[PDB]
Write a protein that binds this ligand. Structure first.
Ligand SMILES: CNS(=O)(=O)c1ccc2c(NC(=O)[C@]3(OC)CCOc4ccc(Cl)cc43)cncc2c1
Ligand SMILES: CNS(=O)(=O)c1ccc2c(NC(=O)[C@]3(OC)CCOc4ccc(Cl)cc43)cncc2c1
Ligand SMILES: [Cl-]
Lengths: 299, 302
């Protein structure tokens, strides 16, 4: 029993964290095989082609523990800088670079000066920001998932928006959201609740013996989406309904039956009651996270 | 900016997790240098669990009865001894991944990271607090016994907890790494229950200072209180008494924000009276008590 926000074991990613210093700027890099990946703003209206052409390999100081790596090449791919080094990382795990969609969750290994300091779980918000926990020097920290023994790198941290939320890119340097890596007026758009994730967390509550919110009612997918749009909740699709199938079969509560519970919770509140120790509806657990935690999958 | 429940990086502990098998029982072990530490109930069958005599069960075992697996490699057990509720298996190979470590016994209110494992394989990491009733609100299934709680200081791992059992309310009980249980629990299937739990007051105050550092001031008021008047109110909401030690510990946060501890105590009294009125504090509609004053300073300053 129990239900916690749980991150993937971070060890395979810890063995890849390095410090990258160029001029007066210091941030984190991800060392995989003979390449170090880091935000391109380490070289900083910037003209990154013009700023990069003026740099030599010896301008980038890369440090892995107490060992300095020698940079033998450099190239830019979108908003990520790729530093070719002379030595392949012997701790390189089996890995892939994957771009995730809003609502998907991942683990973040927060780093400062190439040293990991913490791990937390979070979700890609529908407005493409992440509600992270980052200070100055956190740039280059990465987001990931683990499948068996393969690390899927999905996020690299780049900046903090004025509301305290964070923006970054996939490992190919493409930003999540309409953000740019430049000091200019930028803001997070109006955010919405990840509906499929709230439903998955309501199934996790049922599996853990929290059932007060259940009711005898059902609803149509159209009627639920009309209600959800009024409460700034993301639309629920047939794909989301299908994904929730296994949890629906395990608890005996049809997805549209759980939608009627969610509709009653949105129109009436919790009334002093809690669900899994929370007075708010949690949306940072996917249906797969719920199945993984309520069955004990290992890495 | 931002405030998350944050666990320590788990890599130094992952390289210590092994699987320990005794007959039909399998659980997790912690391999440090040439010793594997695990709950002593690995020598019990489901039949032995009500009133087991561990000294009598252990004396009947030989080294080859213990099967220890580290990855796809079987370790050879060359000795065994019991220390309180932990079994210590001497092995023929020192773990080359043994980090710098210490065994520390923690007090209620203190937080730690838990690396949840099954069959010697890590499956997840989360952040916990030792509740005032000496239980932890963990997330554990069958076979999680032997999973460990820890903190990291520089490059040193402080092991503070080893998981042993689940009480009937779904909460968990365990020991320090010397086998001494936290709380009045025993490693027997006899009727046991968690005592009435309370809120960790010093931790709620630390989290209110974290909200002030992140720009939230809506809950502050023009009032102060005596330490005694605060405690009289707090006990009525099942909050732990706040001691002068707690007031002193909050000193640095008080100096950084400019809000005296007893002035923040007056905001807490008001929040307990009025509730939040549809508002949240650091994205939460409840008062968070699983962040210590030390966690707040580390996450907000470095
Ligand atoms: C709010 N103060 S803080 O917590 O120390 C902080 C400061 C900077 C943080 C940070 N850095 C940045 O956003 C910038 O990094 C150079 C600052 C200047 O403006 C830009 C513009 C574009 C880009 Cl891509 C980056 C930055 C990242 N993540 C978290 C940060 C927490
Ligand atoms: C509630 N079902 S479950 O989630 O699968 C589960 C089952 C057993 C869990 C478990 N095991 C135990 O508590 C016991 O382990 C042999 C079961 C029998 O009673 C005792 C008595 C004393 C001691 Cl020290 C251990 C046990 C631990 N932690 C979490 C557990 C989740
Ligand atoms: Cl302590």
């Amino acid at each position: 029993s129990g239900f916690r926000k749980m991150a993937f074991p971070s060890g395979k990613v810890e063995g890849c964290m390095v410090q990258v210093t160029c001029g007066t700027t210091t941030l984190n890099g991800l060392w995989l095989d003979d390449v170090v990946y880091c935000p391109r703003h380490v070289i900083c209206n910037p003209n990154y082609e013009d700023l990069l052409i003026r740099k030599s390999n010896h301008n980038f100081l890369v440090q892995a523990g107490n060992v300095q790596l020698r940079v033998i090449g450099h190239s830019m791919q979108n908003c990520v800088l790729k530093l070719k080094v002379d030595t392949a990382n012997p701790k390189t795990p089996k890995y892939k670079f994957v771009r995730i969609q809003p609502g998907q969750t991942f683990s973040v290994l927060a780093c400062y000066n190439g040293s990991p300091s913490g791990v937390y779980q979070c979700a890609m918000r529908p407005n493409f920001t992440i509600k992270g926990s980052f200070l100055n020097g956190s740039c280059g920290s990465v987001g990931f998932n683990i499948d068996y023994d393969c690390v899927s790198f999905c996020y690299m941290h780049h900046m903090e928006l004025p509301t305290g939320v964070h923006a970054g890119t996939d490992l190919e340097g493409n930003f999540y959201g309409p953000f740019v890596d430049r000091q200019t007026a930028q803001a997070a758009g109006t955010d919405t609740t990840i509906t499929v994730n709230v439903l998955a967390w309501l199934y996790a509550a049922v599996i853990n013996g929290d059932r007060w919110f259940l009711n005898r009612f059902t609803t149509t997918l159209n009627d639920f989406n009309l209600v959800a749009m009024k409460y700034n909740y993301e639309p629920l699709t047939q794909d989301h309904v299908d994904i929730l199938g296994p949890l629906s079969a395990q608890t005996g509560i049809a997805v549209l039956d759980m939608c009627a519970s969610l509709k009653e919770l949105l129109q009436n509140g919790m009334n002093g009651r809690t669900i899994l120790g929370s007075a708010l509806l949690e949306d940072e657990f996917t249906p797969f996270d719920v199945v993984r935690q309520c069955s004990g999958v290992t890495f």
